[PDB]
Every structure is written in structure tokens, then in C-alpha cells.
């Protein structure tokens, strides 16, 4: 019962860190898809001014 | 002659006038394009900040 409560903590801290990580990535994913979108639009502007 | 010389200077003068306008036109376009690059980056930077 002392071992279990401790493994529970360990389980829960893993669950928290993994969610933490997933949250961070999703933000990096979104932010990069924006950078690509801005660059893309900017590239087609250059092309229209030859 | 010498009207022939003046005729050739006239060409040259007109060619300057055309090339300088050409150049001014090109710059204005480089100005515009760069002021856009500034504005896109600027807007993009403030969006990063709202996504911590």
C-alpha cells in the first residue's frame, strides 16, 4: 500500500508530462503551418512582381 | 555638320530619360515588396506571442 501509492504518483506524473509534451507539439505544429502559409503567400507576391 | 551630333545626343538624352524611369519603376516595386515582407513578418511575430 505504500508501494502502490508511490507507483500511482509515478503513473500520474508520466501522464502529466506526456500531455504536456503533446500540448507543446500541437502548438509547434500549428505555428509552423502558419509560417509556411505566410512564406507561401509571400512567394507568390514576389512572382507577380517578376 | 553638325546637326547630326545633336541628333545623336538627343537619342542619348532620351535613352537616359527612359532608363532612369525604368530604374525608378523597379525600385518602387522593391520598396513595396520589402514593406510587405516587413508587415508579414511583423504580423507573424505577434501571432507567435499569442500562442506562447
Q: What is the 3-state secondary structure (H, E, C) of chain A?
A: CHHHHHHHHHHHHHHHHHHHHHHHHHHHHHHHHHHHHHHHHHHHHHHHCC
CB hemisphere CA count around B9 (13 angstroms): 5
Contact state of A45 with B51 under an 8 Å Cβ cutoff: no
Task: Note the residue count of chain A.
Answer: 50
Determine which helix (DSSP H) or strand (DSSP E) holds B2, and give its type and residue range. none
d(CA A46, CA B32): 10
* Radius of gyration of the CA atoms of chain B, in A: 23
For cell 523597379, what's the residue? B26
d(CA B52, CA B48): 7
**DSSP for B30-52, written as a single string:** HHHHHHHHHHHHHHHHHHHHTT-
What was the resolution (in A) of this experimentally determined structure? 3.0
Contact state of B33 with A27 under an 8 Å Cβ cutoff: no
Experimental technique: X-ray
Chain A CB within 8 Å of residue B32 CB? yes
Chain A CB within 8 Å of residue B6 CB? no
The CA distance from B17 to the nearest CA of chain A, in Å, is: 23
d(CA B44, CA B38): 10
For cell 508530462, what's the residue? A17
Amino acid at each position: 500500500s505504500s508501494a502502490l501509492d508511490k507507483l500511482k504518483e509515478f503513473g500520474n506524473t508520466l501522464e502529466d508530462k506526456a500531455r504536456e509534451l503533446i500540448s507543446r507539439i500541437k502548438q509547434s505544429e500549428l505555428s509552423a503551418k502558419m509560417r509556411e502559409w505566410f512564406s507561401e503567400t509571400f512567394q507568390k507576391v514576389k512572382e507577380k512582381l517578376k
